[PDB]
């Protein structure tokens, strides 16, 4: 017995070094990871997350974003139109305009709209006819561009680390005024300069600026009372930057050799 159970003990010895029976983990899409990261940043600042239509009216895609029927933006050549008036959305701003109007002219508004967007273009390693945006929109009563700047700083840190700085360059979009194009300090080279940032030490990640008076007013808000800031970014681009992904199409091709690299948590590192 202290013979027999003792030599059962020994017939039962194992190499504990051998492969476990895997209990496999599926992957979260890199594009979803970036969106949720950004969801989490803004939930924590009191914002809501809004979804809208992927097929949209040209009033909300365009007219309500300060693109009158003339405007070159609305070329049938560069957007996927379905009729004269209906098309695949080109950005997530229609959702934000539809949302504002519903609020009949009372703030705050503070929303973040991620989603799929669509552009009439030929596909290669840096161009996709379907890709993703996140926009947001804050409308309140003494909203300043200093306030858009602090918000962008948090976004940039969220995405690329606590040490990031930003740079704001003047620019122009019809729906905002003033407008900015936004760079993040390069997360690879401190600020020496590198391939990643085209040896400038700055990488462009966002555009933004103050919501344009006409945009507020077409939606019912009073531009003498309320200001506004908004911004867009592209997870496809962010995640190709962050990881060195070589081909935008890799997001929509679902090679498991691509997808399955994105199982694990990440941190602020050191």
Partner 1 sequence: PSSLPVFGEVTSGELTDRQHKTRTLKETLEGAGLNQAITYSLVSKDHAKDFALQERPTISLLMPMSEAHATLRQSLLPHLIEATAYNVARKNKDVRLYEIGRVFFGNGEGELPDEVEYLSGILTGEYVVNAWQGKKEEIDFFIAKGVVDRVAEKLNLEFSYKAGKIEGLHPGRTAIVSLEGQDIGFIGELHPQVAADNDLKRTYVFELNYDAMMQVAVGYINYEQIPKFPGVTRDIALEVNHDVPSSELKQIIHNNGEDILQSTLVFDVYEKGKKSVAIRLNYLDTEDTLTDERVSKIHDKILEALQAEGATI
Establish if 45 lies at the interface with a copy of itself (CB under 8 A).
yes
Establish if 150 lies at the interface with a copy of itself (CB under 8 A).
no
Closest CA to 252 of 128, 133, 135, 134: 128
264 binds, among partner 1, ligand GAX, Zn ion, none (CB under 5 to 8 A by kind): partner 1
**What tokens does 241 get?**
């930057």
Establish if 242 lies at the interface with Zn ion (CB under 5 A).
no
- Listed ranges 63-71, 117-125, 189-197, 205-213: which one lies at the site for partner 1 (CB under 8 A): 117-125
Shortest distance in whole angstroms from residue 23 CB to a copy of itself: 10
Establish if 143 lies at the interface with ligand GAX (CB under 6 A).
no
Query: Is the CB of 31 or the CB of 233 nearer to partner 1?
Result: 31
Q: Exactly one of 1, 44, 170, 224 binds partner 1 (CB under 8 A); which one?
A: 44
- Listed ranges 78-86, 155-163, 192-200, 241-249: which one lies at the site for Zn ion (CB under 5 A): 192-200
CB 262, CB 34: distance < 8 Å: no
CB 107, CB 192: distance < 8 Å: no
Helix (H) / strand (E) element for 153: namely helix 145-160
| Per-residue CA distances from 167 to 147, 190, 263 (Å) | 15, 15, 33
120 binds, among partner 1, Zn ion, a copy of itself, none (CB under 5 to 8 A by kind): partner 1
Cβ neighbors of 235 (< 8 A, separation 6 or more) are 30, 31, 34, 35, 114, 132, 133, 134
Query: Is the CB of 231 or the CB of 251 nearer to ligand GAX?
Result: 231
Could you count the other beta carbons within 10 Å of the beta carbon of residue 141? 9
- Listed ranges 61-69, 177-185, 211-219, 258-266: which one lies at the site for partner 1 (CB under 8 A): 258-266
Number of residues that bind Zn ion (CB under 5 A): 6
177: annotated binding-site residue?
Answer: yes
91 binds, among ligand GAX, partner 1, a copy of itself, none (CB under 5 to 8 A by kind): ligand GAX
Establish if 108 lies at the interface with partner 1 (CB under 8 A).
yes
Checking DSSP bridges between strand 227-233 and strand 202-211, what pairing results, if any? antiparallel
DSSP string, 58-103: HHHHTGGGT--TT-GGG-TTTS-BSSSSEEE-SSSHHHHHHHHHHT
Establish if 47 lies at the interface with ligand GAX (CB under 6 A).
no
Q: Which residues bind a copy of itself (CB under 8 A)?
A: 43-46
What residues form the annotated binding site? 177
What residues form the annotated binding site for Mg(2+)? 177
């Amino acid at each position: 017995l202290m013979e027999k159970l003792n030599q059962q003990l020994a017939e039962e010895t194992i190499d504990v070094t051998l492969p476990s029976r895997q209990i496999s983990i599926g992957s979260k899409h890199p594009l979803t990871r970036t969106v949720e990261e950004i969801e989490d940043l803004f939930l924590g600042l009191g914002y809501e997350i809004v979804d809208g239509y992927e097929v949209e009216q040209d009033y909300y895609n365009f007219e309500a974003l300060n693109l009158p029927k003339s405007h070159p933006a609305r070329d049938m050549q560069d957007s996927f139109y379905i009729t004269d008036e209906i098309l695949m959305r080109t950005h997530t701003s229609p959702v934000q305009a539809r949302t504002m109007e519903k609020r009949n002219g009372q703030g705050p508004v503070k929303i973040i709209c991620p989603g799929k967007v669509y552009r009439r273009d030929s596909d290669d390693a840096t161009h996709s006819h379907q890709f993703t945006q996140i926009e947001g929109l804050v409308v309140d009563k003494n909203i300043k561009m200093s306030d858009l700047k602090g918000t962008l700083e948090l976004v940039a840190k969220k995405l690329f680390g606590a040490d990031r700085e930003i740079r704001l360059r003047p620019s122009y979009f019809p729906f905002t005024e003033p407008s900015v194009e936004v760079d993040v300090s390069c997360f690879k080279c401190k600020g020496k300069g590198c391939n990643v940032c085209k040896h400038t030490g700055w990488i462009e990640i966002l555009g933004a600026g103050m919501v344009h008076p006409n945009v507020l007013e077409m939606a019912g808000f009073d531009s003498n009372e309320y200001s506004g800031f908004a911004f867009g970014m592209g997870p496809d681009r962010i995640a190709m930057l962050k990881y060195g992904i070589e081909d935008i199409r890799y997001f929509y091709t679902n090679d498991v050799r691509f997808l399955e690299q994105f199982k694990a948590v990440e941190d602020r590192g050191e």
